[PDB]
Amino acid sequence: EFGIFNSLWFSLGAFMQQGCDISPRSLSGRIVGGVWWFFTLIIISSYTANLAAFLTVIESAEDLAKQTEIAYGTLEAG
Amino acid sequence: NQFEGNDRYEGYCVELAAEIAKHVGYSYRLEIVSDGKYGARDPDTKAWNGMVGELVYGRADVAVAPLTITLVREEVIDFSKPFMSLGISIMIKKPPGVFSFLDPLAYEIWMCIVFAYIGVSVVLFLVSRFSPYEWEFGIFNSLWFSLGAFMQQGCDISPRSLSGRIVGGVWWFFTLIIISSYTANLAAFLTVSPIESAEDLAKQTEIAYGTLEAGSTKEFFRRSKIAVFEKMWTYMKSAEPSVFVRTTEEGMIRVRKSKGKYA
Amino acid sequence: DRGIQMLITTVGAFAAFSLMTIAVGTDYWLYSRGVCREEVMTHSGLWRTCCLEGAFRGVCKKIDHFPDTAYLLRAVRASSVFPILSVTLLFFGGLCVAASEFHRSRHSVILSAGIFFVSAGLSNIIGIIVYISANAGSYSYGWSFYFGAFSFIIAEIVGVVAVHIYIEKHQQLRA
Amino acid sequence: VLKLSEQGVLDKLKSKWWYDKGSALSLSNVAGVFYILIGGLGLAMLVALIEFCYKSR
């Protein structure tokens, strides 16, 4: 019963690691399911691994010299 | 080749020598120093070499090169007011893959995973099909379940027999360690920087750092009494192979061809 | 496919057994820098190592497996019992397939080959995991190492076919 | 000693008597789960034969 709407529901469920009430049976259908599952494993692991790196760790005078949006001045008669 | 003599060269100091000659009112011949060294008093022979030696021994009357003003040189030759300011500075080489997502687990781990995936699925098929007590777990369905349970996606069928449930139990545990390790290793890979850091303690690291031989910088490091500079000199004098170079171009190519291992 | 399943199984049993016996016999398992007595490029297998370049090219010496109980890894590799255990079951599995067409009255003879071929593969992966872990504690593998990996797949497919033959043999007996 | 030092003898003796003497995860640290796995199938395969013989008789 993998209609267009069911495939959209299954792919959203399969991508987001929640499972589904229907699974592909045919060899052609199961090859698509397997590669999508492998793809969603890499992206989900990549997201968590990169977020952990972000949470564990102008930034220059040249940056401040190159721009002109932040005004810079001197002392008068100096 | 079209020109010869002082007219064969160009550069800042060439024009500076021309302008000085114009103002002072004298004729001059630009002789390149033979040693190709700036100048230094060899501590053993006590002989001045390079341009400073050429000036002191009388072979030359002026030096219009980028010659640093130093105390040792001022004791033996006269210097004018500086015509350019500068300081010692560090030069470092300024310098993903399509299948890089397999990096966290080595090429050995993947081979055993596919061997285990084939190994367990066949075993699940055998323990669930040869039993006359039971006979849905054919070879194809068993492959789908084990492949499905690998990436945490569930399946439309669950093992019912004791033999089938033990096989599923260990693989369910097995996939938990591998997936958690891959994510944990990827996080370490994505988590792990210039500055007098490697020049704070200095190099600290294989980032060997050298100077030009018979230059003011080498002499500055030799006669330094600053803790960091004394540490750097003690390292540079004893380090092997010689970190020092014979010409600036030589050091430039050494940093360009050391690929960020030479400062 | 009853005739072709017979023809596929016999050669697969012969191929898988033949694939491991050369794989264990030959010494082209690893390519790494070492000494066959200064170190040169070497090719080492389960028992001997021989330099493929230098003055000592062709000279072979026994691998020193014994230069902390979890010693057992060295002992298992030093004896290399799993790779020869894999060959023995493959040899045994072939005989069970061989006697399958002679004693047709018993259906358990062909199941013995099927379980043996599956069991042979399980010792194949264990022998490989032990070998990889032992040698780890740059390198590349020659054709001998891939002979074992391909022998593992062929033996497992035959093991599936032999069991698949049994379930059809008992299905037609019930019908 | 001064003559031996100035003639390079001490340096040669020293050189002769001192110098001339002279992040991918691996299978090694994940080998446990594979060992437990193959032990799982070996036990599971035995359980099938034990239960099959018990069920037959």
Numbering used by the authors:
A (entry chain D): 566 to 622, 629 to 649
B (entry chain A): 409 to 503, 508 to 547, 566 to 622, 627 to 697
C (entry chain F): 5 to 41, 55 to 84, 92 to 94, 96 to 162, 172 to 209
D (entry chain B): 746 to 767, 781 to 815
Sentences from the paper on this structure:
Here we determine and characterize cryo-electron microscopy structures of the GluA1 homotetramer, fully occupied with TARPγ3 auxiliary subunits (GluA1/γ3). Desensitized GluA1/γ3 substantially deviates from this behaviour and, despite the limited NTD and LBD resolution of this highly dynamic state, we could trace major transitions throughout the receptor. First, the GluA1 LBDs splay into pseudo four-fold symmetry in some 3D classes, reminiscent of desensitized kainate receptors, and of GluA2 receptors lacking auxiliary subunits. Second, the NTD dimers translate into a parallel configuration, where some classes adopt an ‘O-shape’ conformation, as described for heteromeric GluA2/3 and GluA2/4 NTDs. Interestingly, these transitions take place despite the presence of TARPs, whose extracellular loops remain associated with the LBDs, and accompany their motions. As apparent in 3D classes, transition of the LBDs towards four-fold symmetry largely involves rotation of the B/D subunits. The B/D LBDs undergo up to 90° rotation along an axis perpendicular to the M1 gating linkers, with the M3 and M4 linkers accommodating this motion. The appearance of non-domain-swapped receptors reaches approximately 30% and is greatest in the class closest to four-fold symmetry. Together with a study implicating subtler GluA2 LBD rearrangements in desensitization, a complete rupture of the LBD dimer interface may lead to deeply desensitized states. Closer analysis of the three sets of desensitized structures reveals a gradual transition of the LBD tier into four-fold symmetry, which is greatest for GluA1 and smallest for the edited GluA2 mutant: GluA1 > GluA2(F231A)-Arg743 > GluA2(F231A)-Gly743.
